[PDB]
Amino acid sequence: PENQAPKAIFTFSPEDPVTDENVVFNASNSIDEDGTIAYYVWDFGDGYEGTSTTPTITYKYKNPGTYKVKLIVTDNQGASSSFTATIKVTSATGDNSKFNFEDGTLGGFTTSGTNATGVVVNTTEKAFKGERGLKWTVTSEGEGTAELKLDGGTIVVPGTTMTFRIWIPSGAPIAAIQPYIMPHTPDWSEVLWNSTWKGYTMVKTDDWNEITLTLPEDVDPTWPQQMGIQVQTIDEGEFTIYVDAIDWLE
Amino acid sequence: PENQAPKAIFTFSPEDPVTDENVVFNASNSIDEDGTIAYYVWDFGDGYEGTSTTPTITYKYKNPGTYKVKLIVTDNQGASSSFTATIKVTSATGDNSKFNFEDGTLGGFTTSGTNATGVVVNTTEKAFKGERGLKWTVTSEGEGTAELKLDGGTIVVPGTTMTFRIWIPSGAPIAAIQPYIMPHTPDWSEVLWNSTWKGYTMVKTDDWNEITLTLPEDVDPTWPQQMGIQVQTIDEGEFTIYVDAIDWLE
Numbered sequence A, B: 001p002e003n004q005a006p007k008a009i010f011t012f013s014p015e016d017p018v019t020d021e022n023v024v025f026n027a028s029n030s031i032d033e034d035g036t037i038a039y040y041v042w043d044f045g046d047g048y049e050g051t052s053t054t055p056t057i058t059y060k061y062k063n064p065g066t067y068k069v070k071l072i073v074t075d076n077q078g079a080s081s082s083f084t085a086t087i088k089v090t091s092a093t094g095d096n097s098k099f100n101f102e103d104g105t106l107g108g109f110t111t112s113g114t115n116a117t118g119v120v121v122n123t124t125e126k127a128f129k130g131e132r133g134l135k136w137t138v139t140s141e142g143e144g145t146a147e148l149k150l151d152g153g154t155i156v157v158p159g160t161t162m163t164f165r166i167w168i169p170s171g172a173p174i175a176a177i178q179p180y181i182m183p184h185t186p187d188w189s190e191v192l193w194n195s196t197w198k199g200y201t202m203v204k205t206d207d208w209n210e211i212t213l214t215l216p217e218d219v220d221p222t223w224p225q226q227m228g229i230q231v232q233t234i235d236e237g238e239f240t241i242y243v244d245a246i247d248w249l250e
Ligand SMILES: [Ca+2]
Pocket: A003, A004, A005, A006, A032, A033, A034, A035, A036, A075, A076, A077, A079
């Protein structure tokens, strides 16, 4: 053996592109130690490939998704090395979440509570993705509980990790908040409870909070499910929580 | 039909118990609407069951884990309802992480960098879990890169989500930080790159940061892997990052 294969590597910018946004891929740290680079071949992971005459190339993805970008660097003697990185493209406008609230509807969500009363509307005031979300206003009367909830056919398969985005205000009479999933027999004689409990002091106030919750893989897949967010209240007061972009795979 | 079955429900405290810590389960919101409750039967999910003569019962778990706690409430006429919640118990002392650093060793981790130099030691100064972690000191000379890394047999199976805990200081000459996993052919002619990129402005400074990263399920399971943390530097300076409790399931 004798010719040394080239070093292949690239970075890209921006790291978090949106659809139809220019991404610049930069292979300039690639090098052939004992010769020169003859080809930069790019596979964009979407069905298209091309080459650059310099170490940089720009590209755009029209569809959201996670793409494998492969660079092959080939030297002046035909020896090659490759480097593959993953790039995530999210939708520039709109919201592809399982519950995205873009149709202007509540998506079956209602409110309940004890020593607290809730109302929910579809809102354009705040959203996590797209233009629309839910706006959930709670009036507490003291120590109590309030829910924003959906009954409850079979919402997720067992094993599924759900992601909730919750906008939680400062100065609110709350002790804790928790997304939940509650499978139950049709007759409600047996109830299963799954939640991600978060203390009010362990939460980003006046900001969006991303909270995950997994339905255990051993739950009966045929049991109807209630999905929702529960707030524990500790004093009198009126506060507004925003909920959007509840999402999971499949 | 005529007898109404009871309402069964409980809460517990603390929500985040450690091993051998008292947990108080409280079924006091359970009620039989048309009679009285005769039995509170508790299944603690660990092999043990018991009853309480009041709505409350205390229990301790000696082993860490996630337990299903089932309450069955039975009324004065033998009708019952059940409510099952999950409780997570973590170890009171020590560290069960895949990389826990409790043996006082580096666990195969080394440092590299360009326009930056790193040193790493096993430390008791800060840890995320248990008594020990890694202490990683980086001297930058300008725009550069530094890694804390492990080569790299087959560290995780494809599909695995790894959790890194990284303590990131304020006032550091850094632009970005990212845990990574880098499968490669034995000859290094083909490299795959997976990372969770975080800007310095999108990170909790002077605090522990929990960052997850998934190795894609389609990676060849036989390729050797480099796992590590990469810091991008932007100016001269000396900064210290603490790393502990890198963890995944299986
Ligand atoms: Ca060469």
